[PDB]
Subunit: 421 residues, 3 copies
């Protein structure tokens, strides 16, 4: 049996008092992780090549993820069965070296480690013909599936509260990768088309986005004994809310009291990302990000986000280092024009099985300091029925109440292990 | 560690619109599976021979099953811990070659693959002395356990709503197998006696069946490089509802509003089954079923079911084939005499690790067409309290409302992998 | 992958009727297990040495526990993700042979097998520097974490119902072990300091214990080809309720109707334990316990417990034996001075992979007899709001109702497998 996975677990404390806390800017879709992760998370993969004959094989792979608060020993939880697929490589003579698969599978996900941000990820139940050699590059075709909690109506209402049927979205993906635009540089282009797929006779709310597009171009350049990726993505309508390749064509959300509420996503997103890891010498490794993401919604409730951070590792020993992370966010409300921002600085002493900034397991002992000043937040007071501004961006002091994390500080510290295998 | 299991996962679509749908006749206890399975289902077994000394060994085996809707990636679920037993072979000199076991175990289950129908399955927590060599055959003894949600009362009421205590049924199984009635043919006989086992001072409803019998005779004949099994089972009373060897001696069911309702099973069942897989040549494999099951209840709410289907596989290549399935059901209501029926036809193109119709993993791309015309259904409107006909068979148009799937059509299609290992 | 664990599963019956029942004295924190365990319980560990270089290694270990009623096959359950840690041995030159770890880990738990009683167990999320060679012995340092369901208030109330915030306790452990006080004897000393760790601005109820101490001294003496441990522990205040090393500094409990209720633990506990396993000859093994535990609470609701039992195994064969267990409990209510007591006698025939009373797997067929006579119980009638005596010890016949198990008998029997691997 092949045993792989990912896991992170630890203990921590907040300077002001109590268990460790984590800091994410309101409106940002990520946090700089080093010394800022507050759960035990683990994926346990057990797979196996079940049949080989020469070039041909069938591999079976699975994934069972667990998330717990790590505030206690016995922590019951509903695990998420995330992968259960079969890949058959070289089963087609005419298209050599290509694999056909089916089943739930984490499919080719691009992400930015330090901020734990997946920026291209259409995984889920699906099927596809992967790595077709096309000469100048490798072509891949897939179709995955997601489903929104409700958003579909059995009959025509004018009442949004009537749209409570789970609504299935489909994504059709096409990628062309490994094209050598230049020396040391490769170029990948992908196109995603997602659409809400309605049952016979069901309807989406009036004005619902229905479908959309995600367009990706990633360029990897080999540098300083590491790499650097430069991405530019542009999504449209139903692809703007999730913003990684998954569709939400219905536009209806539900409050905690089961009330439907219209969160239309007609609009667009433009994401320009650059990240990488570069070694410099024998004592320095450094991971780094820079992003600018702008979701512009027709309903004025978008956001314009900017991040930047660096994680330079300095190696005292082939197995002992001192890692430090510094991240900055700033999100501006599309609706109000206000701005939330934060800066985090973590200083960690780690021991890892390896001399890389990518080597895992790592056992860290760290201290984190975050200072924010947020001038807006989302109104989630009341209920989708009591509240008409439910879910809208709103200034910090709106109607006397308060929104957002405020203008403050905090520092935490602890020990944690992280590992992929 | 020994890693085994079963799993099926895939993506699909319904012709009319939306996610793929599955077709089962109302009253039938099964559906023809090819291109008609709508969930990711998986059992992950991890076992291990923990001690061997010569002929003697102790094997530990476990099973954790997961069922998810496969409409999304992250799908939290409560897994069912199904197996955790220990088998000690050859630990008894006097009864050589025999195994003693204890623990929850899937115990010797007979089933019919294409319709996924288990017809003899008493698995659950249990214990037993297995494979005792008796000369003409091998004798096996077991005792397993099931428990009904309620159906037992702490005191004597006349009110069924008072019978809400979980009620334990016990099954005592005895099988004699591997007797060579003829050349190429073996014969197995089994006898099951199940009884509801009441706590001191508890009572079952008046007229409750309490106990029952299941009697099985299976004959396996080696044929056309495959086999053919011919079964005849006859159950009695408390064994008629589940109809695979498990007892339900209490007769009380509960609606979704926690209301008890009397579903007495005094009566009998007669099941006559014939199924098998036969190869013909080097290009054809064919799986096939034929069944007639009649549950005759004292309360007139039984059913008389007939199925027939065939799954002929034609092999283009040692690893690529074209499988096709055609199934037919017809269930007649014992209460009303009406009839629900359906015919399914699936056409699939698969790639499998093997040249058999039994070879797994298989990766399929299929299209299914089902056409039904049901003239009855069960009344589950209202609640066991509002409704007096709750749970009874009732004609399609009963009291102006409607029951059953109607008279219709639909076609689906998709890709799916299936595998046992 | 390394596959380890623990599991027990079986089938049983109660003499009087129905499924098997288990007998524990009211007020006792344990039951003599042989032939007195009523669930399938299993921990499935999958770990792996992920990196070794000479003396240095990093081991990853995990644990997923399942508990089910074993009254049926399909038993859905929320598994408890209990372990997910990484241990790095020999990563520090200055402190050779020592390990540093982080993650949720079952950390050095002392327990008494036949009664399944852990008497020193601070496991949970944590971190630490283990096995530091100190010359005369090995010094270990750890910090683990627990959290109480509520017990903390966001503001100052005088209303206990206001204290519903989860409250984190921290434990700081220090042990010095393997000191050879004598020939064949070792001595371990540990000191635990636990404190409720409040968020900025939160408050605990007035009079809440807040913190406490656990002090342990265990002495292991090698004897009769086995051992004998003699423990003496003394805890204080917040460490008296759990009584194994974990803190509960808040003092608030909640009824099933979400009502807070004050269960202050200011006071102390004195536990004097002696247990062991000794072989005598080639046919006799015998496990044995003797304990006296006194929790004296300031609020008069403590208890004074005494147990004694022996499990002598007589070996007919290297793989077949006859085990028998005899246990006795007696708990006196601190509040009322009454006494609950019981005596259990189990007689089992087992087959195990080994000639030891410690050899697993074991497959048992047993019969148990328990006879109790309890004269007090806890009042859990009503709700923390209806009831003012909620949770207090109270005589059997208090206010006409009844408390405790009564004065009775019962006998059970069944088959069960148990195994650690
Ligand atoms: O599959 C590995 C990652 O899974 C989880 O990530 C989820 O949560 C993220 C935001 O918190 C999403 O961006 C992502 O799409 C989700 O799958 C897990 O929380 C991560 O830590 C894992 O690396
Ligand atoms: O254990 C393997 C099978 O388990 C499940 O079967 C359950 O559901 C069937 C009806 O849908 C019952 O006949 C059977 O008794 C149940 O155990 C699973 O759904 C099957 O696909 C598996 O092959
Ligand atoms: O981790 C192995 C043991 O875990 C469980 O024990 C829990 O329940 C005990 C009381 O019933 C507590 O003393 C203990 O702290 C808990 O962890 C399990 O029920 C045991 O059988 C296992 O051996």
């Amino acid at each position: 049996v092949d045993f792989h996975g990912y896991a992170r677990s630890g203990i921590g404390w907040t300077g002001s008092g109590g268990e460790q806390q984590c800091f994410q800017t309101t409106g940002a879709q990520s946090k700089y992780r080093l010394g800022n992760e507050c759960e035990t998370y683990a994926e346990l993969k057990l797979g196996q090549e079940v049949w080989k004959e020469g070039d041909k094989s069938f591999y079976f792979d699975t994934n069972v993820a667990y998330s717990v608060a790590q505030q206690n020993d016995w922590e019951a939880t509903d695990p998420a069965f995330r992968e259960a697929n079969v890949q058959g490589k070289n089963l087609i003579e005419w298209l050599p070296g290509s694999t056909i698969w089916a089943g739930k599978r984490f499919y080719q996900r691009h992400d930015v480690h330090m901020i734990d941000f997946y920026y291209w990820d259409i995984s889920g139940p699906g099927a596809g013909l992967e790595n077709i050699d096309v000469g100048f590059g490798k072509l891949s075709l897939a179709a995955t599936r997601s489903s929104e909690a409700g958003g579909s109506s059995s009959f025509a209402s004018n009442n949004i509260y009537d749209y409570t049927n789970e609504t299935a979205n489909d994504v059709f993906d096409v990628r062309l990768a490994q094209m050598e635009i230049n020396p040391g540089g490769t170029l990948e282009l992908g196109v995603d088309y997602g659409r809400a797929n309605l049952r016979d006779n069901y309807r989406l709310v009036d004005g619902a986005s229905k479908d959309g597009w995600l367009f990706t171009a990633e360029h990897t350049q080999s540098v300083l004994k590491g790499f650097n990726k430069f991405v530019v993505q542009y999504a449209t309508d139903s692809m703007t809310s999730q913003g990684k390749g998954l569709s939400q064509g219905s536009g209806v959300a539900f409050d905690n009291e089961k009330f439907a509420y219209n969160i239309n996503n007609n609009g667009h997103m433009l994401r320009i990302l650059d990240h990488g890891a570069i070694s410099m010498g024998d004592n320095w490794d450094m991971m780094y990000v820079g992003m600018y993401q702008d979701i512009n919604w027709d309903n004025d409730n978008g956001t314009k986000w900017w991040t930047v951070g660096i994680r330079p590792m300095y190696k005292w020993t082939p197995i002992m280092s001192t890692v430090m992370e510094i991240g900055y966010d700033n999100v501006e409300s599309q609706r109000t024009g206000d701005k939330n921002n934060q800066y985090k600085i973590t200083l960690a002493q780690q021991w890892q099985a390896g001399d890389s900034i990518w080597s895992r397991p790592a056992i860290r002992v760290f201290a984190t300091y975050a200072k924010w000043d947020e001038k807006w937040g989302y109104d989630y007071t009341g209920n989708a029925d009591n509240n008409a501004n439910f879910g809208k961006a709103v200034p910090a002091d709106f109607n006397g109440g308060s929104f957002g994390r405020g203008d403050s500080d905090e520092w935490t510290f602890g020990a944690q292990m992280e590992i992929w295998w």
